[PDB]
C-alpha cells in the first residue's frame, strides 16, 4: 500500500476557508491491466485552479468519496508534473519512470499521489531521455509541471486564429509582463512576429523594457502611452514603415487597456480576450466595430483543447523541443517543498495568500 | 456488541460518488422489550433505490447521526431480507432464526445488520418452517430479498382496480421481459386473464416468445408489431374471438410503447403507468380519450400499501403460499458475497454499474 495526501473541499468557497487534506490509500499490489500510479513531482497554483475551487469557473470535478471522506469532495489543481511509479500487466504507452501530465483538466494535481488509467496522462521526456536523445537540455520540474496553460495559450493565440506573416505582421498585447505575455513575446521572435507589449509603468520601467525586448518584443509602451491620443500616431509609423499590419490583440486586462490595444490594431483586426483583471469588463468603441471591421473573440484553453488530441499534441511536441534546444524559457516558480511536517493543503492555502509574489509551484 | 457496516451518503447524488461504507455497534445485551436485532441475508438493487439515493424519489429515509458519522447520513435500499438473531422481552411475533423483510420503506437494507423494534419487520417462513408446515418448497434468499417491489406491484395492478373477467378479459404490457412483467405474466395465467406481453425484438425471440408463453402470456408481440398498422386487426381479433374485452393496459415504457398499448384496449379501458423509460411521457391519442373513453391513471406502491397494512399483508401472503406451492418463479438475481475483503459500498456501486447484466442482489 501507498499513503497518499490530497487537497480537497466539500463545499466551494475562498481556499483560505474550505480546503483540507484527507490521508487516503493507493493499493500498488492490485493495479487493473490499464491502471497506472503516479507520483506528482510538482503542481502550481494558477488562477483557474482558484477559480475552481472558488466555485466560479465552469469546469470542475465531482465530488465524491473516493478519497475515503464521508462527504463528497472535490480534488484541486488542473495542471502537475508526475513520475510514473508502476503500472498494470497491460499498459504500453507509460513505464516506471517516465514523467506524465494530466490529458485532461479536473484531475487534481494538488496531491502527493494517483491512481489512473494509462489514458489519463500524457508522457513527456524525462531528463535522462531528452540527453539519451542528444537534447542539449533536460526539462526542469517546473517547466513540466506549468506546460499545460500558459505555453500553450500563447503558441495557439499566436498561431490558431490568423496568420502573421512573418517579418511583417504584429500582434500587440497587454500584460505584457505576465507569463503568457512573456512566452508570447519569445515565441514572436522565434516565429519572426513584429510585436508590441503594452506594460504598467515603474521605477525600473527602462530596464523591463530591454528584458521584454531581449525575449522578443519589438517595442513596449506604458499603459499611460497606450491611452495616449498623442503618442497614438508613432505607433502606426511603425507598423506602416515595417510592411506589415497589426492583425492581432491579445488582452488579459480589459477596460481602457482592452479600448487601446484594440485602436492600435489595422482594419479587420481581431482581439483575444484570455483573461480578466479583476470586475473589468472588455470595453470597445463603435466606432472600432463598424468602420475599422474590429472584431473581438474569446480563448480558453482548457475548451479548445477538450477534444482535439491532435492540436494539444502538436503544441505541446514545439514547447518541449523548444526547451529541450534551450529556446524558450519559464518565468523562475517560487518552489515549496511539501516534507510532512506541514499539512499539503497549508502550503497551497500560503500559495495562494502569496500569489502576488510569483507563480507558486508546491513540490515533492 | 455485534460490528456491523452500512452504506450511507450525506449527500445525494450518484451512486459511483456518494456512497461509502460506515462501522457502527449494535448492542445486542441492551434490547428494550420490544426491540429486534436481525442480520442482512441479501437485498437487492432497484432503481427506485438508485433514484432514492439521487434525490429525485419523493420517498427517502431521514439523514440522521446515528450510524456515528459527523454530518447526517441517510441509509439506502428499501427491500431485503433479514434472519433475526435476538429479541426482546416483550416480542412474541419473532423469534431468533426467523425470516424478515421490512414492514415500511425507508429502512435501509443496504447493510450487514440492524436494530429496529418488531413492527419495523414482516415474518416470511424460513424454508425450515415451509418443510415442517408441510410445503413443497422453502423460500430462496432472493424469493425472500425481492418479494416486496415487483411481485405485490404486478398483483395489485391486475386484481386492485378493475375486475377482469377470468377465462375472458384481457390485460396488455410492455415491458414484457421486465421483472414485473414476468410476474404479471404468471399471474394472469393463476387467475385465468389472457394477456399480450409486448417485449422489444431481439435476435433469440423465438425462445423469449416461448419463455414468456410458459410463464403465462397468451400473447407476445414486438414493439414493432405494437406500432404496425397493418399488425392492428390481427390484435383487436384475439381480443373478439376470446369474447372478452381488454380492459387493463400496464405501462412501463412511455413514448410510442404507451401510445400502441393504448389503442389496443377496448372502449372504457384504463391503463396504469408504474414506470418509465427515461424522459419518455405518457402519450395517449386524443381520440381515445374523446371517442373510447380512455382513462390513464398512475401505481406506486409505496404509495398504495403506505398505511394499508391489510393489503400489504394479503398481497405478500399469496405470493409467499405461490413460492411455497411452486406456482410462482422469479428471475435468477446476479448474486455478489460480501466477505468482508471489499467495502460493502463498492459491492452495491459495482451492481448499480452492472444493472444492465441484470438485476443485482448482495448477499452475505
Known sequence: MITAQAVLYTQHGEPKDVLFTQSF???????????????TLGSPINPSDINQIQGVYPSKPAKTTGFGTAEPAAPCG????????????????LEA??????????????????????????????????????????????????????????????????????????????????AVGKYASQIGKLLNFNSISVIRDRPNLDEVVASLKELGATQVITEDQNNSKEFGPTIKEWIKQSGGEAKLALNCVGGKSSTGIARKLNNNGLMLTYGGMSFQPVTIPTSLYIFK????????????????????????????????????????????????????????????????????????
Open 293 to 364: 471591421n474590429f472584431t473581438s473573440a474569446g480563448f480558453w484553453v482548457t475548451e479548445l483543447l477538450k477534444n482535439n488530441k491532435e492540436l494539444k499534441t502538436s503544441t505541446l511536441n514545439q514547447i518541449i523541443a523548444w526547451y529541450e534546444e534551450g529556446k524558450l524559457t519559464d518565468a523562475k516558480s517560487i518552489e515549496t517543498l511539501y516534507d510532512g511536517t506541514k499539512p499539503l493543503h497549508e502550503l497551497y492555502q500560503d500559495g495562494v495568500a502569496n500569489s502576488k509574489d510569483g507563480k507558486q509551484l508546491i513540490t515533492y
Open 78 to 93: 488542473n495542471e502537475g508534473l508526475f513520475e510514473v511509479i508502476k503500472v498494470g500487466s497491460n499498459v504500453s504507452s
Open 25 to 39: 490509500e493507493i493499493d500498488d499490489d492490485n493495479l487493473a491491466p490499464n491502471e497506472v500510479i503516479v507520483k
Open 97 to 178: 519512470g517516465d514523467w506524465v501530465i494530466p490529458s485532461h483538466v479536473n484531475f487534481g494535481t494538488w496531491r502527493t499521489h494517483a491512481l489512473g488509467n494509462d489514458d489519463d496522462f500524457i508522457k513527456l521526456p524525462n531528463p535522462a531521455q531528452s540527453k539519451a536523445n542528444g537534447k542539449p537540455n533536460g526539462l526542469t520540474i517546473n517547466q513540466g509541471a506549468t506546460i499545460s496553460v500558459n505555453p500553450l495559450t500563447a503558441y495557439l493565440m499566436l498561431t490558431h486564429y490568423v496568420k502573421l506573416t512573418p517579418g511583417k505582421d504584429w500582434f500587440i498585447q497587454n500584460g505584457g509582463t505576465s
